[PDB]
Ligand binder design. Structure first.
Ligand code: HDD
Ligand code: HDD
Lengths: 726, 726
C-alpha cells in the first residue's frame, strides 16, 4: 500500500473552494450530480480500485516494471507481448487536434426553459419549462494549438451540445456577435492568415503578426470583429464572465409552419469581465492553463457557470427593415433595435472524468439542428454546414464518430447506414435499405408535424442565377465598427487604442501598419489619430477628411455593446490574495474571511515560503502558495491584514505583488500597519479611490472592498499607473 | 498589384541581423546555400510568383472570394467543387502531433569529420575528412503539445538525421546525459506522470504537478535526471547554448569486426548558457516562441548553430571497470574518467521552406543506424527500437513515411516491399519477392565488408533465462545525483534548491513533498534541508543521519557537469537592448554600435512608441520596439546612452526594463546622465560589479560591457536581487 495512512491522497466528494483539495474526475468529486446524459455514460465508465492490472485482452500482469530479456542484462525479446501492447497503445495515443478551436475546456450541465415556446417553435427541448435537457459545453480559443495558452487575445468559442428527445442540437457560437468574414469560401484564407505563419510556424496563440494584419488591411469586412478582438472582449477574465452568440440569423419554425428569424445569445449570470492586456499576456506565462483551471475549480466549488439563453426575434416580413443585411454575419443586431428575449437557463455543474475521451473527442457541428429550427442563406453558415461533418472523418477516425460515448444521442437512433471504421452498433435488421419488404420497411420515415415528426426544410423561395457573387447589401464595412467604438466607455476606448497600437508595433512591414491606420480613419478619426500617434504615423489631409460612416438605423451607440457601461458585477466565485506575515492580527483575518465567505468570495493565504505561520492568538494558518508562486495575475483583489509587517515590509516579492495588482487596476485593502505599503504604490496620505484602508479590518473596511470587487476594476486609476515601474 | 511600389514587402535575400527584415522560407532567404539533401528536395519544391491560382486538379479559379449560390443572397450549391475542394483540404490539415517532443524547431545543415575514424568504425560518413554529410536537426521540449511554449523547465531533445551514402543514421538524443528511467516498459508510466493529468489536462509544458512528483518519489532511479531538470540545465538560453547526448552506450564496429563501446556527445561551439527561472517562466508569456525564433533568426543572420560531435570510447574489455553499469541510462560516464574525443563539426545553415512539410513531418528513430554502428542491451534503448517505427504508422499515415520528402535517403534504396497507403514509388521489378529467378534475384543481398557492405549485427554473447527482471547492477540511485550536485557552483546549487522548492510548492498533496524531501536526504543533507526549509518541513533525526552515497570511482566532483564552472562564453549572436530617448547623444550610440558590430553582438533600439527619434546631431534613429513590446527577457544586456534622460526618467516601463534586467542578473551599462537610473536599481554612488558606468560610451565602457557579456550573467549580484520589487 502506497497511499498515505491518513487518506489525504483522496479529495472529499463534496464542494470545496479552489485550492482546498486536489482536483478529481467529476464522477468521483460529485457522484450524485446526475442528468440523463451522465447516467447514459455509465456503460463505458471504468473504475480501478481493487482491480488487477491487465493487458487489454484481460490477462493479469505480474511484473509491470520490466521487459522480458534473455538474462537480466540481456536483450529484449520479441515475444514480450505485454511490453509491445503497452508501448503500441502509448505510441498511438494522439489524434489530430481540431483545425481551429483546438484549445478548449469543457463541462457537463443541463438546460431548462423559463416557459413553453411552442407559439414560435416546435423544438421539443423548448416546449415545456419542466423539460430538462442535458448539455455538454466546450469553451475555446481559435488560433492556438491544444497545448497553447488560455489568456491570449483571441476570439473565444462557446459550443453547446443539447441532448434533446428529438435529436442532438449543437449551438456552435463564439463570444462576439459577428465573425471576421462574409463567405465560407474565404475561411481557409482568413484562418491561414491568423494562424502561425507557414515558413517557421510562429506565432502561437497570437494575432500580432504580419499575415493577420495584411489580410485585415486588404479585407475591410474584417474590421468589425477586429474591433471586438482589440477591445478587452479579446481577453476574458473567465469563460464564466463572457457573452456567447450564435452569430448567424437562423429560423425558428412553429407547428403552423411559420418561420421567425432568430439570433441566439448567451448572457453570463456572473456578469461580463475581462483582464487588461499586460495581465493577460503575463498570465499566459505564469499559468497558461488559467481559464481551464478556473472553470474546473468553479464547478468543484459549486460556483456553477450559469448562462441565460436569449433570442433576438425578427418577423419574416421584417427581413429588409434594417440598413444592414440580416444574412451578413459581419453585422450585429443592436439590442436597442431588437431586444433579447430571455428564454431559459443553462447550469454547468459537473466536470468530465477523462479529458481526452469526453472533451478532446467531442464533436460539435452547427448543422446538427432539430425540427423546429432551420437555417438561412447566410453564406458563412451555409459553408460551415459542409465543414463540420467533413473534418470529423479524419479527426475522429471515420463516420461512426456519433458512437463515441460523449457524442451519442440520448434519444433513439435507427437507420440503414452500416459499417465504417470502428463500428460499435451491431444491426439486427434484415434490411439495410429502404424501401424494403423484408423488415416491413422499418425503421420508417415520419411525416413532419407538431411533435415527434420528421424533419422538413422551410420552403423558402429561391430565385436567381447560379453565381459566385457577394450580395451588394454586404458591401458596407465601417458603420458597425463605428457603432461598436462609440458604445464603449472612455477606458474601454483607451484599451482598444492600446491593443491596436501594441499589435501593429509587432507588424514588421511598415506599409501594412499604415494601411490599417487608413482603415481606422474610415471608422473614426479620434481612434485613427491615437493609434497613429503611437506608431509614429501622421494622418494625411485626405485621411483627416474621410466622412464617418452612417449611424445604424439612427443609433449612435448601444450600451449593451460595452462590457462595463451598465454594471453587472457578481463577486461570487472571485478570489482574493491575503498576504500573510509571521504574526498576523487574528482579528483582521477572522473579519476578512467571514465577510468574504458571506459573499462566496474565495481566498488564498500567501507567504514567503510554504508550511504554516502562527497568528498573534496562536491560530495556526496554513499557507497555500508563496508570493512568486501564486502572482497577483491570479486574483481579483489583494488584502493585507496587520500583525508583524516588518516581517514582509522589505520583501521584494511582497512589494511587487501589490505593484502588479495596482498596475492591473485591482482593488487593494490595507489594515493597520499594512498601510506602510502605501509607499510602494505611491498612495497619498489621505488615500485614493480604490485603496481601502482603516485602522483594522472592521465591517465598513470589508463592505468597501467588496463594493470595489463588484465593480471589477478601478478604472479611475488608469492615469496613475504610467508612473509605476511594474 | 497589392505589394507596395518600393518592394519593402520582400526580405533581402542575404544575411541580415534579427529584426532587420521580415523572416522568410529558407530557399528564398538564402538561395545560394546548398547541400545534397536540399538539392534532392528540388523536385517537390513549389513556387508561386507569376502562376495562376488553381484547384489541386489544375483548373484555374476565376473568383476565389465567393461560394456558388442560387442568387447573390441565395443558398450555396452542392455543385460548387472549388469551394468543397478548398474546404476539404483545410478540414484535413492536421496530423497527430508526436506523443512526446511534440514541440520542436528544425534546420538543415551539414556535418564533416575532422579525420577518418576507420580504425574504430567502418561507418562511411566517418571515413573521410572530405566527406560532407547533409543533416536535418530538430530540437524540442518533451512534455508540451506542438503549440506549447519554448522556455519551459523541461528536458530538451536534440535529434539529428544524417543522410549518409550508406543509409540514414538518426542520432536521437537529449540535452542531459541520462534519462529518468531504466527500462522502456516504464516509459508510458513515466510519460503519463509528467504529461497533463488525465481528468482536466493540466498543466501544459510543466513538470510542477502532483503526478510527476508522485512518480519520482516512488521511483528513485528518476532522481538523477530530475537533478538535471531542476538545475538551470532545465531552462536553456538557446538551442545553440546547450549540450547534446545520445545517453545510451552504443557500439562502433570496425572493418576487423572489433566492437568499441561509445557514448555520443554534442558540444555547443557557442558555449553553455541558461536562463534563470523567473525569466524563463515570464518569457513563456512574453514570447512563447522564443527558442524557435532565436534559432531561425541566427540562421538568417549567419550566426549558424555549430556543434562538435564527440565520442566517449570504452574498450569491450572495460565493460565492468566502473562502479555503475554502462548499460544503465540513468548513469553518466564522467568525463574525468573517459574523455570526450572530438569527432567532427556540424553546422546548421538553412531554415526550412515549409514548417509542416519538413519539420512536422520529419521522422527520427534511433534504430536507424548504418554499418559500422550497433546497439547494446541497454533496456531503455532496446524498447525505443520498437516504438519509433510503430508510432509513425499513425502519426504519418502509414508504412511509406520514408517517401515523405524530408525523410527520404539521398542514397539508393531498393527492396521487395510494396503498396501501403500513399505509396509514391512505382516499382518496375517483375519480382516482389526473393529469392527470385524472374529478375535474376535483383535487388541482391550484400555480404558485410569494410565499405559498402550489408549490415550484420555484432555477435554478442547472450546467456541467461527468459526473465522480467532488473539487473541488480542498476539498483543504485543516489551516487550520480550526488556527483552532479557537488559538481555545481554555489550559485548553481542555489538555483537547484530554488527549482525543487518552487516545484514542490505546486504539489497539492503535502505527503508527496515530504517523500521527495526524504529522497533528497539520501543524496545530500545540505540540499535536503535547504529545500525542507522552503517547504516548512523539518527533517527527522533519522533523515539527518542518512549516510551519503559513495563517490563515483573515486570522484568527489567533475566540473564538466557544471554549466558555468569553466567559462566558455561567446558573445557572437547575443543581443543588447538600447534604451533611446528623444535626443540621444549620437557619439555614445556610434561608439556602442561600432563595438557591438566588431563582436557580432546584435542590438535593438527601443523607445516609448514606434517610429523614429532624432539624435543631438540630427541623425534619425529608427525604433525597433517599445519598452513593453520587446522586454528585457529577450535580450542579454541593456545599454542606456546619454541625451535627454528626463524624457524617459519617470517612464514606468523604461525603469521597469532596468529592474527586470537587473533581477535576472544581466549586464547593464549606463552612460553620462543615464547614470540617474542607478537610483531605480539601488546602485551605490560608487557603483557595483556588473553595472558599467561612465561619462560617455568609449573605449573602455564597451570592453567592460562586452567582458560582462562573455561571462553571461552577474552571479555575484544574486544576494542583492531580493531587495528589489521586480
Ligand atoms: C467552413 C469552415 C468553417 C467556418 C466558415 C467556420 N467554422 Fe467553426 N469550425 C470549423 C469550421 C468552420 C471546423 C473545422 O469544422 C471545426 C474544427 C474541428 C471541428 O470539429 O470543427 C470548427 C470549430 C469551431 C468551434 C469549436 C467547437 C468545439 O469546441 O469542439 C466553435 C465554437 C466554432 N467552430 C464556431 C464558429 C462560428 C461561430 C463561426 C462563424 C459564425 C465559425 N465557427 C466558422
Ligand atoms: C519506448 C518508448 C520511448 C522511450 C523509452 C524513449 N522515447 Fe523518445 N520518442 C518516442 C519513444 C520513446 C516516440 C514515441 O517514438 C517519439 C514520439 C513520436 C516519434 O516519432 O518518436 C519519441 C520522440 C523523441 C524525440 C523527438 C524526435 C523528433 O524531433 O521528432 C527525441 C529527441 C527523443 N524521442 C529522444 C529520446 C531519448 C534521448 C531517450 C532516452 C535516452 C528517449 N527518447 C526514450
Amino acid at each position: 500500500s502506497l497511499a498515505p495512512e491518513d487518506g489525504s491522497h483522496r479529495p472529499a466528494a463534496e464542494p470545496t473552494p479552489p485550492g482546498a483539495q486536489p482536483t478529481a474526475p467529476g464522477s468521483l468529486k460529485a457522484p450524485d450530480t446526475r442528468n440523463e446524459k451522465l447516467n447514459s455514460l455509465e456503460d463505458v465508465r471504468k473504475g480501478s480500485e481493487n482491480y488487477a492490472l491487465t493487458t487489454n485482452q484481460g490477462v493479469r500482469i505480474a511484473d509491470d516494471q520490466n521487459s522480458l530479456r534473455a538474462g537480466s542484462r540481456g536483450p529484449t525479446l520479441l515475444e514480450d507481448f505485454i511490453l509491445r501492447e503497452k508501448i503500441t497503445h502509448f505510441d498511438h495515443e494522439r489524434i489530430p487536434e481540431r483545425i481551429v478551436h483546438a484549445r478548449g475546456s469543457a463541462a457537463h450541465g443541463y438546460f431548462q426553459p423559463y416557459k413553453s415556446l411552442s407559439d414560435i417553435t416546435k423544438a421539443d427541448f423548448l416546449s415545456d419549462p419542466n423539460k430538462i435537457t442535458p448539455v455538454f459545453v466546450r469553451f475555446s480559443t481559435v488560433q492556438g494549438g491544444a497545448g497553447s495558452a488560455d489568456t491570449v487575445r483571441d476570439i473565444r468559442g462557446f459550443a453547446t451540445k443539447f441532448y434533446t428527445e428529438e435529436g442532438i442540437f449543437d449551438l456552435v457560437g463564439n463570444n462576439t456577435p459577428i465573425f471576421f468574414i462574409q463567405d465560407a469560401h474565404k475561411f481557409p484564407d482568413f484562418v491561414h492568415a491568423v494562424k502561425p505563419e507557414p515558413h517557421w510556424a510562429i506565432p502561437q496563440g497570437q494575432i500580432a503578426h504580419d499575415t493577420f494584419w495584411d489580410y485585415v488591411s486588404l479585407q475591410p469586412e474584417t474590421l468589425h470583429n477586429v474591433m471586438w478582438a482589440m477591445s478587452d472582449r479579446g481577453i476574458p477574465r473567465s469563460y464564466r464572465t463572457m457573452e456567447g452568440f450564435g452569430i448567424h440569423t437562423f429560423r425558428l419554425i412553429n407547428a403552423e409552419g411559420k418561420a421567425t428569424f432568430v439570433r441566439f445569445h448567451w448572457k453570463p449570470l456572473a456578469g461580463k469581465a475581462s483582464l487588461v492586456w499586460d495581465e493577460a499576456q503575463k498570465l499566459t506565462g505564469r499559468d497558461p492553463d488559467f481559464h481551464r483551471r478556473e472553470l474546473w475549480e468553479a464547478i468543484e466549488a459549486g460556483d456553477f457557470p450559469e448562462y441565460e439563453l436569449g433570442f433576438q426575434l425578427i418577423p419574416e416580413e421584417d427581413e429588409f427593415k434594417f440598413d444592414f443585411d440580416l444574412l451578413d454575419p459581419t453585422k450585429l443586431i443592436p439590442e436597442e433595435l431588437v431586444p433579447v428575449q430571455r428564454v431559459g437557463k443553462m447550469v454547468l455543474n459537473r466536470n468530465p472524468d477523462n479529458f481526452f475521451a469526453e472533451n478532446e473527442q467531442a464533436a460539435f457541428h452547427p448543422g446538427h439542428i432539430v425540427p423546429g429550427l432551420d437555417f438561412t442563406n447566410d453564406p458563412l453558415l451555409q459553408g460551415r454546414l459542409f465543414s463540420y461533418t467533413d473534418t470529423q472523418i479524419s479527426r475522429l477516425g471515420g463516420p461512426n464518430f456519433h458512437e463515441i460515448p460523449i457524442n451519442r444521442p440520448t434519444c433513439p437512433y435507427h437507420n440503414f447506414q452500416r459499417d465504417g471504421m470502428h463500428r460499435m452498433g451491431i444491426d439486427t435488421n434484415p434490411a439495410n435499405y429502404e424501401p424494403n419488404s423484408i423488415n416491413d420497411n422499418w425503421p420508417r420515415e415520419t411525416p413532419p408535424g407538431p411533435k415527434r415528426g420528421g424533419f422538413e426544410s422551410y420552403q423558402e423561395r429561391v430565385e436567381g442565377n447560379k453565381v459566385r457573387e457577394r450580395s451588394p447589401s454586404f458591401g458596407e464595412y465601417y458603420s458597425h465598427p463605428r457603432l461598436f467604438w462609440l458604445s464603449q466607455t472612455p477606458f474601454e476606448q483607451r484599451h482598444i487604442v492600446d491593443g491596436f497600437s501594441f499589435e501593429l508595433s509587432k507588424v514588421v512591414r511598415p506599409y501594412i501598419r499604415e494601411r490599417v491606420v487608413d482603415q481606422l480613419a474610415h471608422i473614426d478619426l479620434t481612434l485613427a489619430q491615437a493609434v497613429a500617434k503611437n506608431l509614429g504615423i501622421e494622418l494625411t489631409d485626405d485621411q483627416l477628411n474621410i466622412t464617418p460612416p452612417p449611424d445604424v438605423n439612427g443609433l449612435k451607440k448601444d450600451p449593451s455593446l460595452s462590457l462595463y457601461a451598465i454594471p453587472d458585477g457578481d463577486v461570487k466565485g472571485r478570489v482574493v490574495a491575503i498576504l500573510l506575515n509571521d504574526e498576523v492580527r487574528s482579528a483582521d483575518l477572522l473579519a476578512i474571511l467571514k465577510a468574504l465567505k458571506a459573499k462566496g468570495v474565495h481566498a488564498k493565504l500567501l507567504y514567503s515560503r510554504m508550511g504554516e505561520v502562527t497568528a498573534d492568538d496562536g491560530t495556526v494558518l496554513p499557507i497555500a502558495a508563496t508570493f512568486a508562486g501564486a502572482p497577483s495575475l491570479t486574483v481579483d483583489a489583494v488584502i493585507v491584514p496587520c500583525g508583524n509587517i516588518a516581517d514582509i515590509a522589505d520583501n521584494g516579492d511582497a512589494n511587487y505583488y501589490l505593484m502588479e495588482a495596482y498596475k492591473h487596476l485591482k482593488p487593494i485593502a490595507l489594515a493597520g500597519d499594512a498601510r506602510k505599503f502605501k509607499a510602494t504604490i505611491k498612495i497619498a496620505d489621505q488615500g485614493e479611490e480604490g485603496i481601502v484602508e482603516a485602522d483594522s479590518a472592521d465591517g465598513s473596511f470589508m463592505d468597501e472592498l467588496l463594493t470595489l470587487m463588484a465593480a471589477h476594476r478601478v478604472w479611475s486609476r488608469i492615469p496613475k499607473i504610467d508612473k509605476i515601474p511594474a
